[PDB]
C-alpha cells in the first residue's frame, strides 16, 4: 500500500547511482515498506517516472518520494516536482504521491562529518 | 594548529550555502576544532581556495578538508583536488599540510535520516 522511492541526482561517472542502490538496500533490510524503488533525476536509470511506476504497478497506493539531496535547489523545488506532476508543465492513478524534504543540516550530518574528518 | 575546512557544491539559489553555514556552526558547537571554515566550489563566497587560505592566516598547520557531498563525482575526484593543488591542473606553505577527506557515502546514518524524512520529521 506504500512504497518509498529514494530518488538522486545522477551523474556520468556510476557513485551517485552506487549510492541509492546501497541505500535501498539497507532501507529494504529494515522491513518498513512494502515496496522500495530508486529514480535517478539524469544520466541513469532507472528514471524517476520509471520508480514510480514500477511503485504503482507493484500495487502501491502512497508513494512516498525522498530526495536523496542534501540541499534544496531547482533539481527539487521545480525538476522533480515536474516530473512528479505536482507541478505545472507519467500520469497517476488514484494513487497519492507524498513529495518529502531533503537531508538538510540535520545533526547527523555533523555526526558524519566529523568522523571522515578523522578518516572514519 | 588543526583547522576544518568544509567544502561544498554551491549554487544560484542560497540553499547550498546556508547547509555549510549551519553545519559550521554546529561543528563551531562541538569544540573539536580551533578554526573552522567553509568554501563553496562554484557561484558564491566564499570559495575554496579563500577558505584555505583564511584558515592558514589563523595559523593552521592541518587542513583537514571534507567535502560535503552524498557521493564522489567529479566535482570531489578533480575540480576540488585540483583547487587544493593536489592534482596537476591557490599556493600553499612548505609548512603547511593538506588532508583531504572523505564524502558522506551510503552512511547507516543517512538512512537513519532518509527514514525520518520519509515520515515528516
Same mark, same amino acid.
Not at 57 to 67: H, L, T
Not at 84 to 104: H, M, N, Q, S, W
Not at 108 to 118: G, N, T
Given at each position: 500500500?506504500?512504497?518509498?522511492?529514494?530518488?538522486?541526482?545522477?551523474?556520468?561517472?556510476?557513485?551517485?547511482? *552506487?549510492?541509492?542502490?546501497?541505500?535501498?538496500?539497507?532501507?529494504?533490510?529494515?522491513?518498513?515498506?512494502?515496496?522500495? &524503488?530508486?529514480?535517478?533525476? *539524469?544520466?541513469?536509470?532507472?528514471?524517476?517516472?520509471?520508480?514510480?511506476?514500477? !511503485?504503482?504497478?507493484?500495487?502501491?497506493?502512497?508513494?512516498?518520494?525522498?530526495?536523496?539531496?542534501? !540541499?534544496?535547489?531547482?533539481?527539487?523545488?521545480?525538476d522533480?516536482?515536474?516530473?512528479?506532476?505536482?507541478?505545472?508543465?507519467?500520469?497517476?492513478?488514484?494513487?497519492?504521491?507524498?513529495?518529502? &524534504?531533503?537531508?538538510? !543540516?540535520?545533526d547527523?550530518?555533523?555526526?558524519?562529518?566529523?568522523?571522515?574528518?578523522?578518516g572514519?
Open positions: 500500500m506504500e512504497a518509498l522511492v529514494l530518488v538522486g541526482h545522477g551523474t556520468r561517472l556510476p557513485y551517485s547511482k *552506487e549510492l541509492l542502490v546501497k541505500l535501498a538496500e539497507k532501507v529494504k533490510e529494515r522491513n518498513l515498506f512494502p515496496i522500495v &524503488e530508486i529514480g535517478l533525476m *539524469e544520466f541513469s536509470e532507472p528514471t524517476i517516472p520509471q520508480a514510480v511506476k514500477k !511503485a504503482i504497478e507493484q500495487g502501491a497506493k502512497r508513494i512516498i518520494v525522498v530526495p536523496v539531496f542534501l !540541499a534544496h535547489g531547482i533539481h527539487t523545488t521545480r522533480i516536482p515536474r516530473l512528479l506532476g505536482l507541478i505545472e508543465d507519467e500520469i497517476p492513478e488514484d494513487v497519492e504521491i507524498i513529495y518529502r &524534504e531533503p537531508i538538510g !543540516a540535520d547527523r550530518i555533523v555526526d558524519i562529518i566529523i568522523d571522515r574528518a578523522f572514519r
